[PDB]
From a paper:
The pyridoxal 5′‐phosphate ([name]) homeostasis protein (PLPHP) is a ubiquitous member of the COG0325 family with apparently no catalytic activity. Although the actual cellular role of this protein is unknown, it has been observed that mutations of the PLPHP encoding gene affect the activity of [name]‐dependent enzymes, B6 vitamers and amino acid levels. Here we report a detailed characterization of the [name] ortholog of PLPHP ([name]) with respect to its [name] binding and transfer properties, stability, and structure. [name] binds [name] very tightly and is able to slowly transfer it to a model [name]‐dependent enzyme, serine hydroxymethyltransferase.
We serendipitously discovered that the [name] variant of [name], affecting the lysine residue that binds [name] at the active site, is able to bind [name] covalently. This observation led us to recognize that a number of lysine residues, located at the entrance of the active site, can replace Lys36 in its [name] binding role.
Numbering used by the authors: 3 to 227
Write the structure that this text describes.
């Protein structure tokens, strides 16, 4: 049952925040609805969930159009998969957030393809903080330069950072890696305006991510099976 699962995930988020002295409202639950059908998303919507993350552009755009045409208002769609230049226009035209900025060219394409009537597309710069098998995300040493370039794009809004750490079973390493991100996030927040989003943590490392300073957790399986 999707509604029961949302309540259970929101409980674990709330607990983890309270345990480390944070208000549960500091943590956004991003429901990863990739691979789940629109009908299941509609259950989640009926249970109050409003922010959904999609990994593939056409799947995501199809859901977005479906709920727009039902007249369901008030949703926030996050594109959280790797973005190819030949699918940027679809992201720029339909999504509210994109978590995977790791190249200036893709950010500029998104900016150019974003209709002017829409709010600026909220973007996070993706850091490859610890995963040698992934080619997604930049190194931290590239962050200052990329952030400065991205920040000038008027149809984008740089809101913070995202990372997908390498899989890790030890809580200690989960926390230390998440802290590296939180430190980078804090440093960015001092110089840049409206830095408020650290997209960090999934089901298996949710507690360490929240203890370290994440503002947004991405949960898929635990919600949609």
């Amino acid at each position: 049952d999707i509604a029961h699962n949302l309540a259970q995930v929101r409980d674990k988020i709330s607990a983890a925040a309270t345990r480390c002295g944070r208000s549960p409202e500091e943590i956004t639950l991003l429901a990863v609805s990739a691979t789940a059908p629109a009908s299941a998303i509609a259950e989640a919507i009926d249970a109050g969930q409003r922010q959904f993350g999609e990994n593939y552009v056409q799947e995501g755009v199809d859901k977005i159009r479906h709920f727009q045409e039902l007249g369901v208002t008030g949703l926030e769609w996050h594109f959280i998969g790797p973005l190819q230049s030949n699918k940027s226009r679809l992201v720029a035209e339909h999504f509210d957030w994109c978590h995977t900025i790791d190249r200036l060219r893709i950010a500029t394409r998104l900016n150019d393809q974003r209709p002017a009537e829409l709010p600026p597309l909220n973007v996070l710069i993706q850091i490859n903080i610890s995963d040698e098998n992934s080619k997604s995300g930049i190194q931290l040493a590239e962050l200052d330069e990329l952030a400065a370039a991205v920040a000038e794009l008027p149809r984008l809004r740089l809101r913070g950072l995202m990372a997908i750490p390498a899989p890790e079973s030890e809580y200690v390493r989960q926390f230390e890696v998440a802290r590296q991100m939180a430190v980078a996030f804090a440093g960015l927040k001092t110089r840049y305006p409206h830095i408020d989003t650290l997209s960090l943590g999934m089901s298996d490392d949710m507690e360490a991510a929240i203890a370290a300073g994440s503002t947004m957790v991405r949960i898929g399986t635990a919600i949609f099976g």
